């Protein structure tokens, strides 16, 4: 359940809260890390906690909407939804 080094569910929330608001953040690989985690949690069917991460990343990318984070919102949402169309056949509507 590790995500950006954060092991616990409260840790990933607080750490990715910092990652988005305080960092110069690197190439889109770091966004695709959370996309990979969405795909893994899709295989493992732990989408309970992954929905938590999606809706909180919606919150944060909408609150920190500045160029790369605006683009990261569309990138993160779309990629989770296409893999969720592959497995479940429906798109997760956090909005």
């Amino acid at each position: 359940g590790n995500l950006a080094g954060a092991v616990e569910f409260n840790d990933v929330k607080t750490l990715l809260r910092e990652w988005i608001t305080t960092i110069s953040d690197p190439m889109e690989e770091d966004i695709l890390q959370v996309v990979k985690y969405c795909t893994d949690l899709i295989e493992e069917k732990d989408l309970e906690k992954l929905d938590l991460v999606i809706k909180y990343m919606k919150r944060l990318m909408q609150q920190s909407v500045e160029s790369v984070w605006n683009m990261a919102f569309d990138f993160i949402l779309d990629n989770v939804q296409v893999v969720l169309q592959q497995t479940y056949g429906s798109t997760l509507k956090v909005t």
Partner: peptide
Amino acid sequence: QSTGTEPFFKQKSLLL
């Protein structure tokens, strides 16, 4: 300094 590639998310996600 130049680490070649400088991640944050991925860095911690491999460093832990």
